[PDB]
Design a protein around this nucleic acid. Structure first.
Ligand code: K
Ligand code: K
Ligand code: MG
Ligand code: MG
Ligand code: MG
Ligand code: MG
Ligand code: MG
Ligand code: MG
Ligand code: MG
Ligand code: MG
Ligand code: MG
Ligand code: MG
Ligand code: MG
Ligand code: MG
Ligand code: MG
Ligand code: MG
Ligand code: MG
Ligand code: MG
Ligand code: MG
Ligand code: MG
Ligand code: MG
Ligand code: MG
Ligand code: MG
Ligand code: MG
Ligand code: MG
Ligand code: MG
Ligand code: MG
Ligand code: MG
Ligand code: MG
Ligand code: MG
Ligand code: MG
Ligand code: MG
Ligand code: MG
Ligand code: MG
Ligand code: MG
Lengths: 98, 157
RNA sequence: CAGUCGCGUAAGCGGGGCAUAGGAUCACAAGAUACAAAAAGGAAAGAUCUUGGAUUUUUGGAAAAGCUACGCUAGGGAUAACAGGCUAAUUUGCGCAAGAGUGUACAAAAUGAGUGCGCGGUUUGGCACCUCGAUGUCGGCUUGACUAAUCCUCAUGGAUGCAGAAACUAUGUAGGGUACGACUGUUCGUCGAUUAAAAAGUUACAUGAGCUGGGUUAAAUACGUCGUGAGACAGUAUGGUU
RNA sequence: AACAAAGCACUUUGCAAAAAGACGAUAAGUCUAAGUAUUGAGUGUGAUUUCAUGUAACGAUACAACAGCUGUCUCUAUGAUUGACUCAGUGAAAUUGGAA
RNA sequence: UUAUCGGUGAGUAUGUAGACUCGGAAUGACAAAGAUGAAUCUUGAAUAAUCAGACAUAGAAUGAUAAGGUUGUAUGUCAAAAGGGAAACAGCCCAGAACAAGAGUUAAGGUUCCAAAAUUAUUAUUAAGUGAAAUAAAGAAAGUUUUUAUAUAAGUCGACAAGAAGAUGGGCUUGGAAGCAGCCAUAAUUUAAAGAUCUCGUAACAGAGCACUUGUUAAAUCUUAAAAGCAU
RNA sequence: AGACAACACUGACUAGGAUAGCUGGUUUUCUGCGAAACCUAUAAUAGUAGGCAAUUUAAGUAACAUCUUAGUAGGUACAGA
């Protein structure tokens, strides 16, 4: 190609700090909504699905926070900053073994 | 037919498709089922041609000629590649899948040299595999008690 | 729902086919309707309903062959004659890895099948962002600048296959050179005789507001081939305001 | 090298009222012709020789060889004039979105 | 009579998938009730422009798993959207500009200097300016670190000294084959050990090493290999 | 020789009578809302028509959007043989 989209393949230590803090901020929203309902003895299907199949920032591996699964990459991994609107989208789980 | 020339019609054109990319825990084709040693494609998923697999077999036969061995082929060329009309037969292979297998009254080091020379003729990077080692789920070998459910578990840290 | 028929003990079923592949209007023609009837009585020609004949097959429905290199106008440049841009299938562009084999012996002095991993942008291509100096996209002249994958000159490793000499292979290195003529429209090329050697590529054929016109395009004429013909031709020959 | 050309060949024309041919919104009529088959018109060929082809002669046609000649060239130098250049007089043009 | 050729039966055997789907998501779709919400919806009347879109991400078709190629789908941006970041930038990452003021509060992104803000703390690696806002590959190797094993005063590791028997020049083979052209065998024996022989060598013997065995020197976290991270 | 017939000739000059789905241009300010490059038909694909649908402002709304809860249609990813 000729149109230059200068996107580095890896993130900087400053972007990683904000990715860590963005994952840790979505945990407080799900922990606030999950505890607010438990006091009322209530539950939601989407709040129970999240806690089941999604990990917290303290349970994620570094490669799951800064990378995603791309079948067209050599090692099936791609920088998470390559995902559209990656800053306002949730992406924590990748296919097993990849 | 054969493993290099299927019993299919060349006129009927096929779509390109894509090799199988198991994203759900499958381990099909990643273990040695018949022979004692195998040749694993350990880097990426490709589409191998019938000319590349025939040269790989000829390579192993040339190195192991005059010796007693049984070579099993774990792939078949059932994909018609049409390069503008029919061009050749190819096969789609996933990652960490066995290509060949061997068994006989040979030395392990003598077989490594055979599979090593066959890993140069084929495209991509290959790995010598023994019988009894665990399977591969994606690009992760299930070793040290690792199971397919631990790779699916979100909590890994 | 009304009309009135079939089958069935009855319940009931029947407005063709197990489902999915058959075009109107106009005109024209055959039945019915009793609407209107250009003074009036009739009629003709109209109106409603039913129906028929359609590669109406360009099937929402024209009765329809070409040439223009002498072309004209209005436009677009959906890339078309060029160059630049993207790609790298292919190449007369290369490297590396591996080593079947050749080398009396002995893989790696030399040599290297079919292959794998690559660089690069020269040839033939693909694409079409882009209208412009082109179909041999290129030749000669003048004048360069740069590259290094080296023909000559300089330093040098290997060579049971380096005794010497010559030559081979490879590593450094682009300072300066790489001429002259004949025949080929051209570079492609081919040869002659010298020479330490008579190597390549990039620069919009590097360079026509620097030259040439070998070219880049015409109208004339003859011949050849194709077409019923006008004409066409990546044809051939002579001539043709740069 | 094309057109014409002399020569040659073929078709047509009997002239009694209009010879054929050409022309005439379309005729009278005119050229043909004050001509008559050795006449007129049309068509192709292109003297002659041999019956497309070979010679003499001719060509600002195209091409080749040979001899001479020379600044075409090896390889340019010098000289002359008129421009170019400077002073005085007169005084254009294409072009130009705006320009540090 | 065949672990030869094809065929048949059996297999809860292995793989293959656009026109196989027994199993089977998420997503999206339809509609009901309640709640919330910025009127965003429908209808009536009046009445437009537009009908080569482009790129990005995912997943395909096509091409050659080439193209800033061509063609569907999902989502967004540009088109018609300024501002901050991406050195410069239609399409990417943020965020939707009515006008001012403020060391105001933040996004993306950054904080040695150009240039607003850390030469801010903690633990490791790299020595190549690798790298530092656009990853060239396979591969090579006493680069270096860590981990997992591992040798060790019963002397590791390296070096040094000597030995490395006999039947036997194994049989065949060939002009010659004596461990070492090739063919076949290569159970034994005796020793501290010693392959009917791994690399040379001879026309063939001979001859020199190795595997193998003893001793000497000598290590008190100091041996060897594999894989992983980062470099060449 | 498509040669010449007075700037013009593959049919001159002059006067009278055109069209152009194509190109270019279309002039003051403020305010509100705000698209599309898709489908169907078309001798149509550079056009046009009907939709979808932008705007104006009236009448309606059990309107429309989103979520929750229960239900329904349908076989992709995956997985399997
Ligand atoms: K003329
Ligand atoms: K608005
Ligand atoms: Mg560019
Ligand atoms: Mg390979
Ligand atoms: Mg009447
Ligand atoms: Mg009457
Ligand atoms: Mg139609
Ligand atoms: Mg229709
Ligand atoms: Mg275009
Ligand atoms: Mg040999
Ligand atoms: Mg050299
Ligand atoms: Mg030497
Ligand atoms: Mg010498
Ligand atoms: Mg010098
Ligand atoms: Mg040139
Ligand atoms: Mg120029
Ligand atoms: Mg002509
Ligand atoms: Mg002719
Ligand atoms: Mg002349
Ligand atoms: Mg004659
Ligand atoms: Mg007459
Ligand atoms: Mg003639
Ligand atoms: Mg003649
Ligand atoms: Mg004359
Ligand atoms: Mg003056
Ligand atoms: Mg495109
Ligand atoms: Mg526009
Ligand atoms: Mg912007
Ligand atoms: Mg910066
Ligand atoms: Mg402040
Ligand atoms: Mg500062
Ligand atoms: Mg650097
Ligand atoms: Mg759109
Ligand atoms: Mg139009
Ligand atoms: Mg099912």
């Amino acid at each position: 190609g000729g149109l230059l989209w200068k996107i580095p393949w890896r993130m900087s230590k400053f972007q990683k700090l904000r990715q860590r803090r963005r994952l840790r901020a979505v945990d407080n929203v799900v922990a606030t909504i999950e505890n607010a309902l438990a006091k009322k003895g209530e539950t939601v299907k989407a709040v129970e699905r999240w806690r089941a199949e999604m990990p917290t920032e303290a349970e994620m591996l570094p490669k799951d926070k800064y990378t995603i699964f791309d079948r067209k990459e050599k090692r099936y991994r791609k920088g998470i900053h390559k995902l559209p609107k990656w800053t306002r989208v949730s992406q924590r789980v990748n296919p097993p073994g990849y | 037919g054969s493993w290099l020339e299927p019993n299919l019609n060349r006129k009927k054109k096929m779509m390109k498709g894509r090799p199988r990319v198991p994203t759900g825990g499958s381990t099909k084709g990643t273990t040695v089922v018949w022979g004692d040693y195998g040749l694993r494609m350990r880097d990426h998923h490709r589409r191998i041609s019938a000319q590349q697999l025939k040269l790989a077999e000829d390579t192993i036969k040339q190195r192991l000629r005059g010796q007693k061995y049984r070579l099993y082929k774990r792939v078949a060329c059932n994909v018609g590649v049409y390069v503008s009309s029919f061009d050749h037969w190819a096969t789609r292979v996933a990652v960490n899948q066995i290509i060949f297998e061997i068994r006989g009254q040979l030395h392990e080091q003598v077989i490594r040299d055979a599979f090593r020379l066959a890993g140069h003729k084929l495209p991509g990077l290959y790995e010598f595999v023994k019988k009894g080692d665990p399977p591969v789920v994606g690009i992760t070998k299930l070793e040290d008690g690792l199971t397919v459910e631990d790779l699916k578990n979100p909590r890994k840290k």
